[PDB]
Design a protein around this ligand. Structure first.
Ligand SMILES: Cc1cc2nc3c(=O)[nH]c(=O)nc-3n(C[C@H](O)[C@H](O)[C@H](O)COP(=O)(O)OP(=O)(O)OC[C@H]3O[C@@H](n4cnc5c(N)ncnc54)[C@H](O)[C@@H]3O)c2cc1C
Length: 469
């Protein structure tokens, strides 16, 4: 059969390999993975006696049209609530940096203002951030009754919603997120849920369905040589259009290479990763699209200091405002970008996106644990709060084979750029899959899976056309 090489063993590469290998007239296929394990940005680990997810956490929109929801149900990875029709159809403590609780009514008021504005942006099919700020500023000019203290509290609360949105988009700033394309991203119905035993159970299940020795780990690709006529070392010295050159020196001829490497990797290395250089159209989509950093900081405590019914500890930074912030501006300290902490169902998980998140990665584990212990002592107004016992944090920007968390349609790029990312090279010598190749489900596990299946289907159609001719 034809020789296929899949670069990367995340859910896109695994989905492509599974669909191709399950074909009754299967090709000779190898998956080349840079790291020691499969799953890529789905990365579940044994930590603090439990399971922590360093990458993907939720099935976003766990309903009928979500293929990740469908697989997780087929595989027995979901609990009873997650499987329910009620769930498919669809608890915080808010702390100010002054060590006082924030009014629930005020929080609701600002959430309605902020998310109503988000809903408006999703209908314009410059930046999301600029639109929100212009509308918020207009509303501020109508806050006649409020004393300067109330207006200050309202802007501070709004700043945390902007930081939460930075986590959602995987951007440093909403001012970097293109306005017109924003609404193309599709939200499927359902109350987002976890896979209790680990999201990695999903990719381990797909991986195990592949023929033995399909995936080679610790086998990073250095350069894909395409548009050539390359002899294989053995008889009958057949010519192949592609030669995959591995970092370890391996010379692998192939008829088709499915590239599923992250956009951050392509941004750093597209100039050396492809020989000849990618066509300009594709090179420019790689450059123009966004690829931001979002990290998780897990903190273990000997005893919980939060209420047992508490699921998220939201932080509001006093005297902060989104109206002062610009696309490339930084917060006063890296930790002011942190939105708060999800209580693991005694573990907390802090979320932080952007340049402050990349800066966090440069700090030692010790600095992060100590700094966040002081932040927690500050925001809960408790100087005797015991320090966290342990820390485990993701470092997505630093990861040489990822270089960030996920794609977004940045100012300067459109949904057409996600289509350019998916466009194959001539003769289907090189195909592209991955979350940054899906126009409406980019930045998700389901987008990545669907893109893998799309490339498997494109190849099967070519092979079927060779038989007919
Ligand atoms: C912090 C974080 C939170 C997220 N939260 C969610 C969430 O809750 N829900 C959700 O649906 N999505 C979420 N996502 C997004 C989701 O994880 C991804 O969109 C999806 O997993 C990407 O799959 P992929 O196959 O496209 O890429 P990857 O999973 O990154 O797979 C690409 C593979 O390519 C390999 N590789 C790279 N370079 C080379 C090379 N030169 N040679 C060989 N192999 C190479 C990598 O090691 C990797 O295994 C999150 C991601 C992160 C990081």
């Amino acid at each position: 059969g034809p020789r296929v090489l899949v670069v990367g063993s995340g859910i896109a590469g695994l989905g492509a390999a599974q669909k191709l290998c399950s074909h009754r007239a299967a090709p000779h296929l190898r998956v080349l993975e840079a790291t020691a394990s499969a799953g890529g940005r789905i990365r579940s680990e044994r930590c603090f006696g439990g399971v922590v997810e360093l990458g993907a956490h939720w099935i976003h929109g766990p309903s009928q049209d979500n293929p990740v929801f469908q697989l997780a149900a087929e595989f027995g990875l979901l609990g009873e609530k997650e499987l329910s029709e009620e769930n498919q159809l669809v608890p915080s403590m808010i702390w100010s940096s002054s060590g006082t609780s924030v009014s629930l009514e005020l929080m609701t008021e600002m959430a309605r203002l902020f998310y109503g504005l988000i809903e408006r942006t999703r209908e314009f099919l410059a930046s999301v951030g600029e639109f929100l700020k212009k509308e918020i500023s207009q509303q501020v000019a109508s806050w006649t009754e409020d004393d300067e203290d109330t207006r200050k509290r309202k802007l501070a609360i709004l700043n945390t919603f902007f930081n939460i949105e930075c986590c959602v988009s995987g951007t440093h700033s909403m001012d970097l997120v293109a306005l017109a394309p924003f609404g193309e991203y599709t939200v499927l119905p359902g109350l987002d849920c976890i896979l209790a035993g680990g999201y990695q159970g999903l990719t381990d299940r797909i991986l195990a369905s592949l023929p033995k020795d399909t995936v080679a780990f610790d086998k990073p690709v250095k350069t894909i040589h395409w548009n050539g006529s390359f002899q294989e070392a053995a008889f009958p010295g057949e010519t192949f259009p592609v030669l995959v050159e591995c970092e370890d020196g391996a010379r692998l001829p192939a008829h088709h290479v499915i590239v599923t490497v992250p956009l951050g990797f392509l941004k750093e290395h597209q100039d050396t990763f492809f020989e000849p250089p990618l066509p300009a159209k594709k090179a420019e989509a790689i450059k123009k699209l966004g690829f931001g950093t979002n990290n998780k900081i897990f903190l273990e405590f000997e005893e919980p200091f939060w209420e047992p019914d508490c699921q998220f500890i939201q932080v509001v930074w006093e005297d902060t405002s989104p109206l002062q912030d610009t696309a490339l501006s930084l917060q006063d300290t890296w930790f002011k970008k942190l939105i708060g902490f999800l209580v693991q169902p005694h573990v907390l998980c802090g979320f932080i996106a952007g340049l402050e998140s990349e800066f966090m990665e440069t700090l030692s584990d010790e600095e992060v644990l100590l700094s966040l212990t002081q932040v927690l002592r500050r925001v809960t107004g408790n100087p005797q709060l015991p320090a966290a016992k342990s820390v485990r944090r993701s470092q997505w920007h630093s990861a040489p084979y990822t270089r960030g968390s996920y794609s977004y349609v940045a100012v300067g790029s459109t949904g057409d750029d996600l289509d350019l990312m998916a466009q194959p090279l001539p003769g289907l010598q090189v195909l592209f899959a991955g979350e940054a190749t899906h126009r409406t489900f980019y930045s998700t596990t389901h987008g990545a899976l669907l893109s893998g299946w799309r490339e498997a289907d494109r190849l099967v159609s070519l092979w079927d056309s060779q038989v007919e001719q």
